[PDB]
Amino acid sequence: RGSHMEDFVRQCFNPMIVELAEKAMKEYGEDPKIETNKFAAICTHLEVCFMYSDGGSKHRFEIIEGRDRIMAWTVVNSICNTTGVEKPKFLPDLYDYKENRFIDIGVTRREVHIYYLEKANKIKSEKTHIHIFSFTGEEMATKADYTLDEESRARIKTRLFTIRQEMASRSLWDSFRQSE
Amino acid sequence: RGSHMEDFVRQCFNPMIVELAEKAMKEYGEDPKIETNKFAAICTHLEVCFMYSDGGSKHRFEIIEGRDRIMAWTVVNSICNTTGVEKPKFLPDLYDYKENRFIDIGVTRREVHIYYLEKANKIKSEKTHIHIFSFTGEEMATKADYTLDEESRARIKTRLFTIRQEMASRSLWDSFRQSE
Amino acid sequence: RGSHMEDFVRQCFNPMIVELAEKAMKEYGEDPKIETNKFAAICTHLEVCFMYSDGGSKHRFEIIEGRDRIMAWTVVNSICNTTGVEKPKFLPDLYDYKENRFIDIGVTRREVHIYYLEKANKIKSEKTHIHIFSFTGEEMATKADYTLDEESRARIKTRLFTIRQEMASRSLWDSFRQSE
Amino acid sequence: RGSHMEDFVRQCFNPMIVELAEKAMKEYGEDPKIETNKFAAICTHLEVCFMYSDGGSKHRFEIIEGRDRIMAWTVVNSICNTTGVEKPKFLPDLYDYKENRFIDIGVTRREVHIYYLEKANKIKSEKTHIHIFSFTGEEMATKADYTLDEESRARIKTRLFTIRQEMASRSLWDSFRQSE
Ligand SMILES: O=C1c2c(O)c(=O)ccn2N([C@@H]2c3ccccc3SCc3c2ccc(F)c3F)[C@@H]2COCCN12
Ligand SMILES: O=C1c2c(O)c(=O)ccn2N([C@@H]2c3ccccc3SCc3c2ccc(F)c3F)[C@@H]2COCCN12
Ligand SMILES: O=C1c2c(O)c(=O)ccn2N([C@@H]2c3ccccc3SCc3c2ccc(F)c3F)[C@@H]2COCCN12
Numbered sequence A, B, C, D: 001r002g003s004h005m006e007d008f009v010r011q012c013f014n015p016m017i018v019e020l021a022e023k024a025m026k027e028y029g030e031d032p033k034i035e036t037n038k039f040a041a042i043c044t045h046l047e048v049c050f051m052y053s054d055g056g057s058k059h060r061f062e063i064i065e066g067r068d069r070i071m072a073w074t075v076v077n078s079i080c081n082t083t084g085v086e087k088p089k090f091l092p093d094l095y096d097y098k099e100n101r102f103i104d105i106g107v108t109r110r111e112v113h114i115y116y117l118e119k120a121n122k123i124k125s126e127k128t129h130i131h132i133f134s135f136t137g138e139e140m141a142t143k144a145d146y147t148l149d150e151e152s153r154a155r156i157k158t159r160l161f162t163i164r165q166e167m168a169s170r171s172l173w174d175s176f177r178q179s180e
């Protein structure tokens, strides 16, 4: 079962990010060779999260993404027990030591408005800061507080649009978009 | 056809920069072993662009130079579609997320004034910021806005003059200058 | 004599930190394969000190920890003879060129209050700044002056709690805590 | 002719710095295996210069030291022709793009006062900034302008005193000091 999307993912993303995404899907029992749109989404979300955590000042963010589930919750636990924040119901993506809150990042193929609505009504962890990015350059953040300065977010949006174009160039964009 | 200028270029410039320049000429069908003055100019322009993008704050610049033409235009496209800037008629060298504009860098063996005139009247992309450097330490930037702080530009000018001297020391300077 | 704690230490800590801790115990004649709780404490203290010295601005701290005793005292001597600070009675962990004082860092399994009391009454080098961290997220610093900004200290506390959890997960936490 | 001082130098200094010092002595025809005190002085001066240039902000300094004589003068030439500073009579150690002046660094085994006098009366390049360091923690800079912030200079003085101690520990200090 060799998908053009699998080969595309492997050439489009850093090998470390492909490895971490494969390990994520295996931690949830999914298979990157079958759920290839999901493979691509997970790689994209990972790259966005790493770029995001690179946006801050040094030591600003604790990266929860890209860890195995047990260790991700371990670090969440330590953050909660040393800071006093409430433990989220669902796994966040980052923790912000500057603003002292968890960040749940999202990347959507649709209007950021409706994806943000879904996530907010899902988690309802309140304290957890939400930050949606779209493949068209839109973003949406809790309380209109976008955490990072403009240029760091602009980089992320540029990269998302480049991924979109690469997929389109290979005719994978349609199925990806109509898979979410 | 072994030129002293080819060997000089290979010893004067970083091997990565020589490789990227060779790939640029091949993308336009030119041959570094024949167009050796052009080889040297492309290597120089590349080093200047990389030093330039190093001048900013972290994440400040998107580097368009040193990519294949298709991918360079891809990244231009993403920048335009996420920021709303007008798409330049000709390929720029960088994008500035701080000031939100494309930078077309030039390096000339003549008066910066006349090279800047040529480029401005050529592209006339208006929004695109022009920044000329010369092999004698002069520079010229759109609206007298030089983007970078003094020291970062001084480094570039020093390196340009050192290249000029190295060429002169080997007696390549005259043909280079009278080739532009 | 193969301890679960020895294997745990070797998988929990960076190999460089394990090596430096082994060399420390050998410099004092102790054996990491027997004093395994002490092995773990020394590794932890080392990681905390390195994170601490990473918190500052560049060039801010001189690291005294992780050197052999002779060289540690050599660097203390040079600091004292170039700055004019009084030579501590006991080896400190860092020197702060910004605030111009030695830092003795401590990590305790008990109330930071009582460990700080013990160290202060022990060294009584006055000028030497004390900074206690606990495995529960508490800290205590001379004159309520915590040297580093909040986020750098938060990172350290998170890591301490993660170590605590890893030990607990393996059922080593109890003996560790009841060993201090 | 195997000197304890040669072996000491090779173990005390980074291998890159030993290599650059050997190349310096060869550029002036001297031999590190005979002029071993001079070998040590050149290595020390090199380490001080590199620490110095590390003190600044990024791009602040152009390093003239550690180049072959021809290329050192080449870079001096480029600095002079792009900035307009007067060309020093003797080779400086650094150039400061922030303050726009050449720095001649000195390291002395005697009172900084008398070494500074000697150098100032020697070069008399006026514009060239002088900065003396001593093996006892004293420094002396033109116009009481010490260029770098306190901590960066403190590091240098600490390292100088550590070198002094290492030499003393091996009984080389006396001959070194009575060689200058
Ligand atoms: O962290 C996430 C996660 C997000 O953070 C997210 O933003 C969107 C979606 N997520 N989910 C990610 C994920 C992440 C990125 C893109 C798509 C998916 S789709 C489901 C899935 C995920 C991981 C492995 C796997 F096999 C999956 F089927 C799961 C939800 O359980 C916690 C971890 N996690
Ligand atoms: O980006 C440039 C470019 C510049 O950015 C530039 O400043 C001057 C000149 N350029 N041109 C560069 C180039 C770049 C630097 C120095 C000389 C040349 S000379 C023509 C040429 C170039 C690349 C390959 C090649 F084979 C060429 F003949 C082309 C114009 O088409 C877009 C890419 N490009
Ligand atoms: O630097 C320290 C040191 C501290 O800095 C410290 O905070 C607590 C305790 N220390 N001691 C450390 C140490 C460091 C960290 C955790 C536990 C121990 S327990 C005794 C011991 C140490 C080193 C080797 C060894 F074999 C030991 F038995 C010794 C006191 O002699 C100066 C060096 N040193």
Ligand SMILES: O=C1c2c(O)c(=O)ccn2N([C@@H]2c3ccccc3SCc3c2ccc(F)c3F)[C@@H]2COCCN12
Pocket (backbone or CB within 6 Å): D024, D025, D026, D027, D028, D029, D030, D038, D041, D042, D043, D045, D046, D091, D092, D093, D104, D105, D106, D107
């Ligand atoms: O740059 C220096 C230099 C200094 O910058 C300096 O501060 C003191 C002394 N210098 N001199 C250095 C030197 C540098 C550091 C310590 C001792 C010496 S002692 C003579 C000597 C030097 C280099 C090679 C050699 F074989 C020598 F005999 C020569 C003076 O000619 C320009 C280069 N240079």
Ligand SMILES: [Mn+2]
Pocket (backbone or CB within 6 Å): A065, A091, A092, A093
């Ligand atoms: Mn996640």
Ligand SMILES: [Mn+2]
Pocket (backbone or CB within 6 Å): A045, A092, A093, A104, A105, A106
């Ligand atoms: Mn997410």
Ligand SMILES: [Mn+2]
Pocket (backbone or CB within 6 Å): B065, B091, B092, B093
């Ligand atoms: Mn270009």
Ligand SMILES: [Mn+2]
Pocket (backbone or CB within 6 Å): B045, B092, B093, B104, B105, B106
């Ligand atoms: Mn250009």
Ligand SMILES: [Mn+2]
Pocket (backbone or CB within 6 Å): C065, C091, C092, C093
């Ligand atoms: Mn210690």
Ligand SMILES: [Mn+2]
Pocket (backbone or CB within 6 Å): C045, C092, C093, C104, C105, C106
């Ligand atoms: Mn300590």
Ligand SMILES: [Mn+2]
Pocket (backbone or CB within 6 Å): D065, D091, D092, D093
């Ligand atoms: Mn010199």
Ligand SMILES: [Mn+2]
Pocket (backbone or CB within 6 Å): D045, D092, D093, D104, D105, D106
């Ligand atoms: Mn000097």
